[PDB]
Amino acid sequence: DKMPDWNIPSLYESYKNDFRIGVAIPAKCLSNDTDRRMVLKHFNSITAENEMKPESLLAGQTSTGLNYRFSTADTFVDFANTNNIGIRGHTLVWHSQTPDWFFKDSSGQRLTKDALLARLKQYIYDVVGRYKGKVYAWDVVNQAIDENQSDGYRRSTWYEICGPEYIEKAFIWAHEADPNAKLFYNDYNTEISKKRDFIYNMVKNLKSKGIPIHGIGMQCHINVNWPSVSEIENSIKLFSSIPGIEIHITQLDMSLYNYGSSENYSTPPQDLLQKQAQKYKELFTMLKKYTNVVKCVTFWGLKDDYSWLRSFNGKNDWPLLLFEDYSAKPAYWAVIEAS
Ligand SMILES: OC[C@H]1O[C@@H](O[C@H]2[C@H](O)[C@@H](O)[C@H](O[C@H]3[C@H](O)[C@@H](O)[C@H](O[C@H]4[C@H](O)[C@@H](O)[C@H](O[C@H]5[C@H](O)[C@@H](O)[C@H](O[C@H]6[C@H](O)[C@@H](O)[C@H](O)O[C@@H]6CO)O[C@@H]5CO)O[C@@H]4CO)O[C@@H]3CO)O[C@@H]2CO)[C@H](O)[C@@H](O)[C@@H]1O
């Protein structure tokens, strides 16, 4: 019952003078003819949804270092490179998406700070080096900020063993391994004022002291009720006040539900689909005011039944621009209208 329309306006072409338009996809899309054609019609950047995370690239360890499994990730990078589109690297440092043995030695022992930092250098050199010149942007560090901590830092194993030095060292080493990649700090809920302030100061201070961070990634996992487009704009205004910092919108999607709500729909309510469309229109009208700093906007999924949100919350959701049958949503037409 698939109903892709090959003749409607290309998303990225509609925004060609504003910013790249990207999509996160899983590996299965690369072997599906309909998915591939839809990706290349509408998007000029991709992100591997899961297949370039540390848990996906790491195969294990021995007495002398790390062992990798790159076959699937190679297919993503080759797909982008041979089809003249960019691929954003998701992600070098991300505690929850890293296996627990990574933080212990081959004898099952928890690593000292110096041993873990040495392992981090090895990982970054190996992964960024393999793809040197082929990944235009890396999310180097993801989700290091926790606004309920007094100093703002998430108390992950990275922080507990290394303190905050792991953040700046990850950027230094990534920039050594591929000097031409744009390097991002990536996070979510950047519209919570206290978190925004922690991120702003962290990145400002890194940049001041010469750390090669080039951008902030705002995930923008949002919903039809929160945050307001004005709040997203306030984040863009503050982050873009840092000289030399660009912005990518890295994982945009818009749940039809409030977070923590027990609503559960079998079919998408039309009034929420209209609220979604109007908010996507407002969002993109706002983003077009900041094309000097916002260089890429990536949607976290090709179509609604591919959304991570369905498994994550255990219910149907319709957060993206295409329906399950590949057909355009009101949201799609709103994004085209905003262009
Ligand atoms: O991670 C495994 C799967 O990841 C998927 O993709 C990831 C991506 O790779 C990653 O980079 C990133 O990570 C997510 C985190 O791992 C996850 O824990 C986090 O949960 C968020 C949720 O996304 C977010 O929408 C939610 O927002 C709430 C907020 O918590 C709440 O405080 C706020 O409250 C406000 C009130 O609503 C308002 O009335 C009042 O005025 O102000 C309040 C604020 O003070 O409301 C918002 C929404 O209503 O918070 C939770 C955590 O608390 O989400 C991260 C990203 O959002 O993003 C992707 C998602 O995981 C992969 O695709 C998949 O394949 C992997 O298996």
189 lines ligand 1 (CB under 6 A): yes
Structure tokens at 296: 């890429």
**DSSP secondary structure letter of residue 153:** B
Q: Using CA atoms, how far apart are residues 27 and 73, in angstroms rounded to an integer?
A: 9
56 lines ligand 1 (CB under 6 A): no
Report how far ligand 1's centroid is from the alpha carbon of 256 (Å).
14
259 lines ligand 1 (CB under 6 A): yes
Q: Using CA atoms, how far apart are residues 41 and 331, in angstroms rounded to an integer?
A: 17
Nearest one of 159, 157, 83, 94 to 127, comparing CA atoms: 94
Report how far ligand 1's centroid is from the alpha carbon of 142 (Å).
13
Structure tokens at 159: 């922080």
Residue 301: partners with Cβ closer than 8 Å, 6 or more residues away: 23, 24, 25, 49, 253, 307, 308, 319, 320
**DSSP secondary structure letter of residue 259:** T
Q: Whose CA is nearest to atom 3 of ligand 1?
A: 308
> Treating both helix axes as pointing N-terminal to C-terminal, what angle do 165-177 and 113-130 enclose, rounded to 10 degrees?
30
Query: Which is the closest atom of ligand 1 to the Cα of 250?
Result: 11
Residue 153: partners with Cβ closer than 8 Å, 6 or more residues away: 144, 145, 146, 159, 164
DSSP 260-300: T-----SS--HHHHHHHHHHHHHHHHHHGGGTTTEEEEEES
Nearest one of 145, 150, 153 to 188, comparing CA atoms: 145
Q: Whose CA is nearest to atom 5 of ligand 1?
A: 308
Helix or strand run (H / E) with residue 215? strand 215-218
How big is the CA angle at 232 (ends 205 and 229), to the nearest 5 degrees? 170
Helix or strand run (H / E) with residue 332? helix 330-338
Report how far ligand 1's centroid is from the alpha carbon of 260 (Å).
11
Mutate to test the pocket of ligand 1, among 148, 188, 300 (most ligand atoms within 8 A of CB): 188
Cβ atoms < 10 Å from Cβ of 183: 23
Q: Using CA atoms, how far apart are residues 66 and 124, in angstroms rounded to an integer?
A: 11
258 lines ligand 1 (CB under 6 A): yes
Task: Provide the resolution (angstroms).
Answer: 1.9
Residue type for position 95: H
- Report the DSSP beta bridge partners of residue 221: 253
DSSP 106-152: TTSPBPPHHHHHHHHHHHHHHHHHHTTTT-SEEEEEES-B-TTSTTS
DSSP 197-213: HHHHHHHHHHHHTT---
47 lines ligand 1 (CB under 6 A): no
Which CATH architecture fits 1-339?
Alpha-Beta Barrel (3.20)
219 lines ligand 1 (CB under 6 A): yes
Cβ atoms < 10 Å from Cβ of 223: 21
Q: For residues 72 and 53, is the Cβ–Cβ distance under 8 A?
A: no
276 lines ligand 1 (CB under 6 A): no
255 lines ligand 1 (CB under 6 A): no
Phi and psi for 48 in degrees, rounded to 5? -75, 125
Segment 309-318 long-range contacts (CB within 8 Å, at least 24 positions apart): 309/253, 309/255, 313/257, 315/257, 315/264, 315/265, 316/264, 316/265, 316/266, 316/267, 316/268, 317/255, 317/256, 317/257, 318/256, 318/268, 318/272, 318/273, 318/276
214 lines ligand 1 (CB under 6 A): no
Q: Whose CA is nearest to atom 8 of ligand 1?
A: 251
